[PDB]
Design a protein around this nucleic acid. Structure first.
Lengths: 155, 41, 218, 141, 121
RNA sequence: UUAUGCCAAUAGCAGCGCCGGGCAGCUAAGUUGGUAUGGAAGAACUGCUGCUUAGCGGGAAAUCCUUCUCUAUACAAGUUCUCGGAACAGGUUUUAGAACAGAACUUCGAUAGGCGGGAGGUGGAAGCACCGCGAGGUGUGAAGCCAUCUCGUACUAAACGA
RNA sequence: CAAGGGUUCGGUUGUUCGCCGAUUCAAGUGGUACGUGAGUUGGGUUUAGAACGUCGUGAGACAGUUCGGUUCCUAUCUACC
RNA sequence: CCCUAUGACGGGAGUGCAAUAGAGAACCUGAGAUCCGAUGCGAACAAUCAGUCGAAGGAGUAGUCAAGCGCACUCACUCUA
């Protein structure tokens, strides 16, 4: 739903930059920290820590995504519904067959700095688990992760 | 113990609302809310 | 219950909105007595066909009753007029499948319901006001010949420094009880009339002494 | 329906005095949600003026009291409503003032010299007809 | 001059009772003030009314004021003398109650140029 | 027991004065209705492939979805129709109710009262006639009354000229 | 493996425990300030009286026994309906 | 003396070195706690010894001065967050 997925870019400042993080389906944390930077504007020189100049960074195709080891069926997500007793728990297989966007959204949410600009930063983040995005007509800068991936290999 | 802050906050939402429509005996003097027996004619 | 009413293999047909008239007592051919409720359907009609295409969801907007321009508040006079649909006492929406989709302006009635099968009602029940425990939840109470200022009250949450003054979401005396409570999987409809469009049900349908009930499950 | 907050003996033994005074005098000024209550005894004591038999007179002897407002009823209120079928009091809402926020209300009869809302004319009732249930009024627009 | 002033001293009805009603006409037209006052029930309204009408009359008898171009600009209360007294309780424990008194002030000015907003209302 | 002189028929009071009844309302000792299906993941436990790394399937009143309830202050704050003198507000009630709230009615009107008709409860009115000295009985007579329920009627109070 | 739902009445004792009688699908083990008195009870037990046995040479005590022995709070806040 | 109030301690007029609402009667000077105000900014999606340091803002806005009547300085200044 173009409306319900185009988000609230009618709320931020728009006039800075649109950038695209397309995980090629490799790795959660190494996508994540890169995001938590770009989506915190600490990567350009004019940083000043009492403000939000987070650029728009848009992640693409969270269906094609890779998380190594066998955490997939081991690391659940835990959450407490207030009502005595309850602890609603959900494995990552469940989470990924449900909506593989929420996963990374929550992860970077936790990585971002623990202050009340955190929500007011995620207000500058949008996701499609496809390559199909309606935020194309805007000035689109696809982004490249650092050239720092030696990728040690094992028998 | 609890100060102007809470005291004002509690006495406020008990504020006086100006009364709506209010009619007067066009010539018979008094003023009144609707549905009264001011007068006769 | 299948192969009846008017649909294909599997769907949900729309619900029909009626009025609790009272209760009485019938009998069967095997000479046994069943209580009876009479639900009056006031010429319910279709007033809006909701659309996943245009709006987003599949819903038939059945109106019930009769109302007058001196009784409607203009924002709905406009609705009814734009639909071009006779005036009704209360509106109600139902979500029903892609099939079982009706034309704007087709009236409904009790022959929509095949006898002998079941229904699900929903009647905004008969609250009692700001009741207290021992009736709101069937709590007990301390004796009436030993204990003072408790003869009819309740207990106390678990409580001590652990669970620190944190009464979990418990059970206290509370406001009224008027709400909508289904009677799931009702027992078969005795009889419905061609004219007069009533219908008798085995009994215990929620809702007031009139003005409130919905029906579905068929 | 009202209790007025009074033991059910004292409540009657007040309402009697109130209707009786409402008949001795012609107008009274009383708390509305109690005028809304004499609104019934006044009429059911007018009906006995209209009937006037020995039975329905010795019955009114119990409900009215104080003075011979009994005779006042039987003699003038009958003869002034021998036609008026129902509705024998006006119960206007003057809310004059009290010091207790208690509303106040004029209550007095209808076809007198100087009433408060100059009445409609006492028309005899039309006679009953069989009720029907067509439910045929579409009220479309 | 301007800001015609009318006070009333020794109003023997407590201040949190007087200001409660004064806040109703805290800032609007004198006519509708005198009108909402006589349809409120609270029995501070009679003194608040005495005061606003006395202000209007003083504003007239002093030159340069149109008692229809008037509207109360400011008005408030203020505690005055209250002659304390003893207060009794069970168990011989005593206390004190203070019969209160207060003053009220009203300060009016012409409706200088705000009719233009008012008609817009 | 006190009063209406007395008879007659009523009233007050005895914390309904005490009895026998008692509709609507409320309640349960009464009556209903539920204690399910379908779907996924998957416990030990079980099998079979494998190819020695692994592959999948059954597999529990268990977990999660489907029913019921609550929800857009769901701050990515959602969608549809319609009103624009529109929504309110006030007044008569209410199947709703502590105020607020909801819902009904607001004079081209049944909103409540009132009056007529029934229903529904008590259970043979008074006066009159008879039988007996009386206590008292029988007829006139399912009489007499009426808290509620329905049904007729705007007769009262709910328009509105702020 | 499993906490989803359950886990009874009555007899003597203040009893927790426990014994018992009658039942059930079963009559679970601990935590929760040995949950819970600004919710209730107040029987035990730790005030003053009184008495029995024992100890003290008396005044008195008894981790022995029996009888009787005022239960305060108008809810600010957090929590919650 | 007038003016609105039931009634003025009120408001004017007036005496007075005093404006006497900064001597109006308990009456000089009149302070802090306390209360109601008026203005300017902030304030109903953001959690706590309530701040300190930074700070986008908003607002009220001064001056000197050759140079030209502006602009460009006074890190202008003051509140605010």
């Amino acid at each position: 739903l173009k409306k319900a997925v185009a988000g609230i870019k009618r709320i931020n400042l728009d006039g800075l930059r649109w950038r695209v993080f397309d995980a090629r389906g490799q790795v959660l944390g190494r996508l994540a920290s890169q995001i938590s930077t770009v989506l915190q504007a600490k990567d350009k020189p004019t940083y000043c820590p009492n403000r939000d100049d987070g650029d728009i960074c848009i992640v693409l195709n969270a269906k094609e995504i890779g998380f190594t080891g066998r955490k997939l069926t081991d690391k659940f997500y835990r959450w407490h519904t207030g009502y005595i007793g309850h602890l609603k728990e959900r494995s990552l297989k469940d989470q990924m067959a449900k909506d593989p966007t929420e996963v990374i959204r929550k992860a970077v949410w936790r990585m971002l700095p623990s202050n009340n600009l955190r929500d007011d930063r995620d207000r500058k983040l949008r996701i499609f688990e496809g390559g199909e995005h309606p935020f194309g007509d805007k000035p689109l800068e696809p982004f490249v992760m650092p050239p720092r991936r030696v990728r040690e290999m094992r028998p | 113990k609890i100060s102007k802050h809470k005291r004002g906050i509690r006495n406020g939402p008990k504020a006086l609302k100006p009364v709506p429509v209010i009619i007067r005996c066009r010539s018979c003097g008094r003023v009144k809310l609707p549905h009264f027996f001011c007068c006769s004619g | 219950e299948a192969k009846q009413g008017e649909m294909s293999s599997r769907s949900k047909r729309t619900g029909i909105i009626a009025v609790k008239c009272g209760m009485t007592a019938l009998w069967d051919k095997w000479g046994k007595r069943i209580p009876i409720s009479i639900l009056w359907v006031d010429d319910n009609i279709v007033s809006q066909v909701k659309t996943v295409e245009k709006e987003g969801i599949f819903a038939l907007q059945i109106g019930c009753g009769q109302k007058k321009p001196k009784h409607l508040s203009k924002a709905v006079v406009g609705h009814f007029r734009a639909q071009g649909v006779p005036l009704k006492r209360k509106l109600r929406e139902f979500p029903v499948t892609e099939d079982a989709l009706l034309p704007v302006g087709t009236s409904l009635g009790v022959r929509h319901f095949v006898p002998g099968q079941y229904v699900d009602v929903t009647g905004i029940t008969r609250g009692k006001g700001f009741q207290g425990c021992m009736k709101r939840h069937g709590f007990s109470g301390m004796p009436a010949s030993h204990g003072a200022s408790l003869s009819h009250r309740s207990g106390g949450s678990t409580g001590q420094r652990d669970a620190p003054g944190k009464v979990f979401k418990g059970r206290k005396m509370a406001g009224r009880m008027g709400a909508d409570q289904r009677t799931v999987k009702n027992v078969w409809v005795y009889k419905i009339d061609p004219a007069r469009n009533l219908m008798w049900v085995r009994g215990q349908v929620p809702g007031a002494e009139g003005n409130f009930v919905f029906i579905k499950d068929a | 329906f009202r209790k007025l907050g009074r033991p059910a003996g004292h409540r009657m033994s007040m309402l009697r005095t109130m209707v009786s005074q409402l008949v001795k005098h012609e107008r009274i000024e009383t708390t509305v949600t109690k005028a809304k209550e004499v609104r019934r005894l006044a009429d059911n004591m007018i009906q006995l003026g209209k009937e006037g038999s020995l039975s329905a007179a010795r019955r009114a002897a119990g409900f009215v009291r104080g003075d011979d407002v009994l005779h006042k009823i039987f003699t003038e209120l009958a003869h002034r409503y021998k036609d008026r079928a129902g509705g024998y009091t006006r119960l206007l809402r003057t809310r004059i003032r009290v010091g207790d926020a208690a509303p106040m209300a004029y209550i007095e009869f209808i076809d007198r010299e100087n009433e408060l809302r100059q009445s409609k004319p006492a028309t005899p009732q039309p006679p009953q007809r069989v009720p029907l249930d067509p439910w045929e009024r579409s009220r479309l627009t | 001059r301007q800001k015609v002033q009318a006070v009333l001293k020794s109003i023997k009805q407590s201040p949190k009772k007087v200001n409660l009603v004064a806040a109703l006409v805290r800032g609007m037209r004198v006519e509708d003030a005198l009108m909402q006052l006589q349809v409120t029930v609270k029995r501070a309204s009679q003194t608040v009314y005495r005061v606003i009408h006395a202000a209007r009359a003083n504003a007239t008898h002093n030159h340069g004021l149109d008692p229809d171009r008037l509207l109360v600009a400011e008005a408030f209360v203020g505690k005055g003398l209250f002659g304390k007294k003893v207060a009794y309780h069970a168990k011989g424990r005593s206390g004190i109650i203070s019969i209160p008194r207060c003053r009220l002030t009203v300060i009016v000015r012409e409706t200088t140029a705000e009719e233009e907003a008012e008609i817009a209302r």
